[PDB]
Amino acid sequence: SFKCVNSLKEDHNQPLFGVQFNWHSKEGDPLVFATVGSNRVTLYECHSQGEIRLLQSYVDADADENFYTCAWTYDSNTSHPLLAVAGSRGIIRIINPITMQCIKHYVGHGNAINELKFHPRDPNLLLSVSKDHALRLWNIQTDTLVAIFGGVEGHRDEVLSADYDLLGEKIMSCGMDHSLKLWRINSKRMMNAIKESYDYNPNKTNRPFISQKIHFPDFSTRDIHRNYVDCVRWLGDLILSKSCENAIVCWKPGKMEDDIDKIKPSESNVTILGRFDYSQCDIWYMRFSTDFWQKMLALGNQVGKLYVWDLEVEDPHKAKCTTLTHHKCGAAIRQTSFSRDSSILIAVCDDASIWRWDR
Ligand SMILES: Cc1ccc(-c2cnc(NCc3c(F)ccc4c3CCO4)n3cnc(S(C)(=O)=O)c23)c(C)n1
Ligand SMILES: Cc1ccc(-c2cnc(NCc3c(F)ccc4c3CCO4)n3cnc(S(C)(=O)=O)c23)c(C)n1
Ligand code: NA
DSSP states (O other), X not given: OOEEEEEEEOTTOSOEEEEEEOTTOOTTSOEEEEEEETTEEEEEEEOSTTOEEEEEEEEXXXXXXXXXEEEEEEOTTTOOEEEEEEETTOEEEEEETTTTEEEEEEEOOSSOEEEEEEOSSOTTEEEEEETTSOEEEEETTTTEEEEEEOSTTSOSSOEEEEEEOTTSSEEEEEETTSOEEEEESOSXXXXXXXXXXXXXXXXXXXXXXXXXXXXXOSEEEOSSOSSOOOXXXXXXXXXXXXXXXXXXXXXXXXXXXXXXXXXXXXXXXXXXXXXXXXXXOOSSOOOXXXXXXXXXXXXXXXXXXXXXXXXXXXXXGGOEEEEEOOTTOOSOEEEEEEOTTSSEEEEEETTSEEEEEEO
């Protein structure tokens, strides 16, 4: 079971909106996690006796920047970890976590970026989701915009979250229009766009890189939640998503026995496989997370309580819940992160505090 071994507070005293363990950290190296809040990104190392060792921060030159998200990848030639961050300015920064140097930045969108995710099988492909109602897929090896997911049948309001499935063949996005939308990226059009992004070298051609504009999702529903959908994750062929209605819903497109790859864009049904209720988490902008193996699900609430669900059961509705509290932890938990082996769970709060729970 989990025990609270340490806590820390960042000097900016502003909310921490994101936290991610580096699941690409090398064997024998201590566990490292990044936090994002205010106009900063900070790295920490987990040590024995609950020690949280402070390393170094990246501080944006714009005091008005507010980082909302971060995601780890690694350099495709050297294997060294890389960290991407973004937020209110709509700028994607690729940071070398060793020196905390910004090694490249993309003017990602014409509005804030709410989430960043790297492709599960390709470390060069970065997905950003924005307040401009679109998703964008970047190839950070050739600095190209592969595709824009949005348009005439895309999201109709700010996009808050998105996730790749296990194989990275498809994306599920969600946002302020109450909808969850599916975008297949294993179509002939998208596989060709990705191949061409890798073949693009602006020094060796005259053409600009032509980005795809994908105006139509492969599936859409507004039948799961009745408010802003602010977090989505795939659980195999099933989806986990939440709104501010004190519930994570586990569902799937189509009827009970419909295969996800047979779902057509006109599909009008959804199937609910279960719902994980909790309390006092009815404010917008609260994230849930799963561990590496997807054996566990974690979410913090607006009064500092953590809920952890054991997903190692025959059906989703049988998930077993554990609650974790500490008398000194009373601020809203915006995001959690498990270490790759799930031995540590970190929670970050609105009062700039960091909470470490060891298994
Ligand atoms: C005819 C052809 C076209 C495209 C690709 C291709 C595709 N997708 C990624 N990555 C994303 C990725 C992946 F990793 C695993 C599964 C997956 C995807 C995208 C959708 O399903 N690629 C990376 N390099 C390439 S390459 C060798 O430069 O083309 C790809 C391939 C293999 N063949
Ligand atoms: C005082 C203050 C400042 C900023 C934010 C905030 C926070 N996070 C994102 N996005 C990241 C994001 C998200 F999209 C979905 C879920 C989620 C998060 C962060 C944690 O769980 N924001 C986007 N717009 C805003 S805003 C400025 O209110 O419109 C935010 C909050 C809640 N409070
Ligand atoms: Na830079």
